[PDB]
Structure 1
């Protein structure tokens, strides 16, 4: 089926993180595509991708990047689609450079930013799912089931 979400990431090294978004979208039966695209190192590849996303039928972009992380924000510069950003954890600064580079977007060019690392990738997929669920009742039901099961599965007392 035609992708409605695009997962893009700056590098192969970002995939250990962004695969969590891929897995969750697949689990919720959301057709999507997964690509490597760098703002800083393949800027023209990014311009092409972002400019044509809407016409290609994408509804949400999930963008993961670390360091001087510009991929989500430059994606958002070229598309009117909602862009969600995932700060990939960095070696020295533990993703704080990633986070501030992504979240502190200027007024007029939004990126909805999630947690540093794998939890953020998962939440970007879940946030994308909640956006798509607004217009897709079957997906809304799947998402409801998924969230309810998460809540129901939290243990009640610790084991030693």
Structure 2
């Protein structure tokens, strides 16, 4: 069932990752977007195995109405940065926890982007993935007060739960 007939169901966030195994990490961002009723798309897009496709994905993101891209990658983690080099939409990079170096390689490859090409970097692993969802929502919430108000209530409920 398509949703071309609902502007409000059209993707605002693109959630991408270099491999299907990254989905174990990237699902957390998507759970947040589900919780906040923010429409999104999720795809495998590999910087190294599908480079042309990555460029196509990045180039067309804004015309397709995406406001934010969330990109996860591990090791020599180039996906977030190369997507960022190809769009001026904000790009959030989630370092996936790699086998040998526990995401230290992931983190440095993503966060140390040169002047001109920011990537919004979050924590290694599942906390970062959750936080990518939330940051995408915060970005949407800088224009849409309803989303902002919902983030406030969500945080307020957690505070109460933890404190009590």
Question: Shorter-chain TM-score: which interval?
Answer: over 0.9
Structure 1 unaligned spans of 5+ = none
CA shift at 1:155, angstroms? 4.8
Normalised to the residue count of structure 1, the TM-score between the two structures is 0.95
Is 1:57 paired with 2:65?
Answer: yes
CA shift at 1:40, angstroms? 1.1
Is 1:148 paired with 2:133?
Answer: no
Is 1:4 paired with 2:17?
Answer: no
Aligned residues: 156
Which whole-Å CA distance do the structure 1 matches of 2:89 and 2:95 have between them?
Answer: 19
Which whole-Å CA distance do the structure 1 matches of 2:157 and 2:24 have between them?
Answer: 25
| Alignment match, 1:96 | 104
Structure 2 unaligned spans of 5+ = 1-8
Q: CA RMSD in A?
A: 0.8
| Alignment match, 1:87 | 95
CA shift at 1:148, angstroms? 1.0
- Given candidates 15, 19, 40, the residue that maps to 2:23 is 15
Which whole-Å CA distance do the structure 1 matches of 2:143 and 2:117 have between them?
Answer: 24
Is 1:25 paired with 2:33?
Answer: yes
Which whole-Å CA distance do the structure 2 matches of 1:40 and 1:146 have between them?
Answer: 38
What SS does structure 1 have at the residue aligned with 2:143?
coil
What SS does structure 1 have at the residue aligned with 2:151?
helix
**Superposed structure 1 runs of 4+ greater than 2 Å apart:** none
What SS does structure 2 have at the residue aligned with 1:67?
coil
Which whole-Å CA distance do the structure 2 matches of 1:151 and 1:14 have between them?
Answer: 30
Which whole-Å CA distance do the structure 1 matches of 2:158 and 2:97 have between them?
Answer: 25
- Given candidates 138, 150, 154, the residue that maps to 2:146 is 138
Which whole-Å CA distance do the structure 1 matches of 2:161 and 2:79 have between them?
Answer: 35
Structure 1 residues 31-67: Cα deviation after superposition (integer angstroms, max 9, x where no partner): 0000100101110010000000001000000000001
Which whole-Å CA distance do the structure 2 matches of 1:115 and 1:149 have between them?
Answer: 23
Normalised to the residue count of structure 2, the TM-score between the two structures is 0.93
Which whole-Å CA distance do the structure 2 matches of 1:88 and 1:155 have between them?
Answer: 31
What SS does structure 1 have at the residue aligned with 2:105?
helix
- Given candidates 91, 105, 126, the residue that maps to 2:134 is 126
Which whole-Å CA distance do the structure 2 matches of 1:155 and 1:93 have between them?
Answer: 36
